Amino acid sequence: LHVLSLMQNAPSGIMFFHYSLIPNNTITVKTTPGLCESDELGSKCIVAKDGVLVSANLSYWQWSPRNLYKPENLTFANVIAVSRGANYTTLNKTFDIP
Amino acid sequence: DGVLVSANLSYWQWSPRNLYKPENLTFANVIAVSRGANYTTLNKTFDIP
Ligand SMILES: *[C@@H]1O[C@H](CO)[C@@H](O)[C@H](O)[C@H]1NC(C)=O
Ligand SMILES: *[C@@H]1O[C@H](CO)[C@@H](O)[C@H](O)[C@H]1NC(C)=O
Ligand SMILES: *[C@@H]1O[C@H](CO)[C@@H](O)[C@H](O)[C@H]1NC(C)=O
Ligand SMILES: *[C@@H]1O[C@H](CO)[C@@H](O)[C@H](O)[C@H]1NC(C)=O
Ligand SMILES: *[C@@H]1O[C@H](CO)[C@@H](O)[C@H](O)[C@H]1NC(C)=O
Ligand SMILES: *[C@@H]1O[C@H](CO)[C@@H](O)[C@H](O)[C@H]1NC(C)=O
Structure with missing residues (x-):
């Protein structure tokens, strides 16, 4: 994952400073x-807004960004309501969000 | 996640972006939006809730 990349001069050349984000600690979760x-x-039916839906082997589903796990209770802000396009997961209970 | 399609046919259908497997358009494969560009008026009401 790429953040920022500066370039500097060098003898007979040019040298780049590619700053990146290698992840190290994975955590295995469930993802619809x-x-x-x-x-x-x-x-x-609902889908996440700019993120992935996530549960850490937990009873209910949560929101987290695409490349990093900071789980949040899903609200109106981070959730897009769409359709029955693919086979989404039926959790067999009504929503907690207006 | 597809393109709207008609095989010189009276009504419009759904097919993926790079391959032709036409389907009757339903609630699942259709997003309702706006009058952004000039979309095609088919001059009949919908068959989908
Ligand atoms: C979730 O369950 C899997 C089942 O294989 C387990 O390996 C993993 O450690 C669990 N992770 C968490 C965060 O509960
Ligand atoms: C998220 O919701 C659960 C109940 O669904 C609640 O117990 C918890 O405090 C909430 N907040 C978190 C995990 O930050
Ligand atoms: C509840 O979920 C199960 C499997 O997740 C499935 O039978 C169906 O989606 C629901 N069943 C009933 C009786 O509502
Ligand atoms: C559709 O109409 C065009 C008109 O030029 C014709 O060339 C083509 O063969 C037709 N294709 C189908 C699938 O009906
Ligand atoms: C699609 O709809 C038409 C009528 O609009 C129907 O005759 C046909 O059987 C449907 N199914 C297909 C093409 O698989
Ligand atoms: C029906 O379609 C035609 C051309 O497709 C256009 O005049 C308009 O969109 C509609 N006309 C009427 C009278 O509804």
């Missing part, structure tokens, strides 16, 4: 594309 409450085609 999105959550449904109803089995019916045409149900109210």
Whole structure:
């Protein structure tokens, strides 16, 4: 993951300072594309806004960015409501978000 | 996640971006948005809730 890259001069050349983000501590979680409450085609279903839906082997689903795990309770802000496009995961309970 | 398509046919269908497997458009494969560019008026109401 690329952050910033400066360049400096050098003898007979040029040398780049590529700053990056190698990750080191993985944590294994569960990840859906999105959550449904109803089995019916045409149900109210949701997907994450600029992130991935995540559960750390936990009873309910959460929000986390695409490349790093800072889990958050999913709200209206970080959730896009769309469709039954792929097979999203039915969690068999109604929403906690207006 | 696809393109709207008609094989010189009376009504429009859904197909992926790079391959032609036409499907009747449903609620699943259709996003409702706006009158942004000049989309095509088909002069009939929808068949999808
Ligand atoms: C989640 O469950 C998997 C099952 O294989 C386990 O290996 C892993 O340690 C668990 N991770 C967390 C964060 O609970
Ligand atoms: C997230 O929601 C759970 C209940 O669903 C609550 O117990 C917890 O305090 C909330 N906040 C976190 C994990 O920061
Ligand atoms: C609850 O979830 C199970 C599997 O996750 C599946 O049978 C269906 O989505 C739901 N079942 C019922 C009876 O609502
Ligand atoms: C569609 O119409 C065009 C008109 O030029 C024709 O050339 C083409 O063969 C037709 N294709 C199909 C699949 O009907
Ligand atoms: C798609 O809809 C048409 C009518 O609009 C129907 O005749 C046809 O059987 C449907 N299914 C297909 C093409 O698989
Ligand atoms: C029906 O479509 C035609 C051309 O596609 C255009 O005049 C307009 O979009 C519609 N006309 C009427 C009278 O609704």
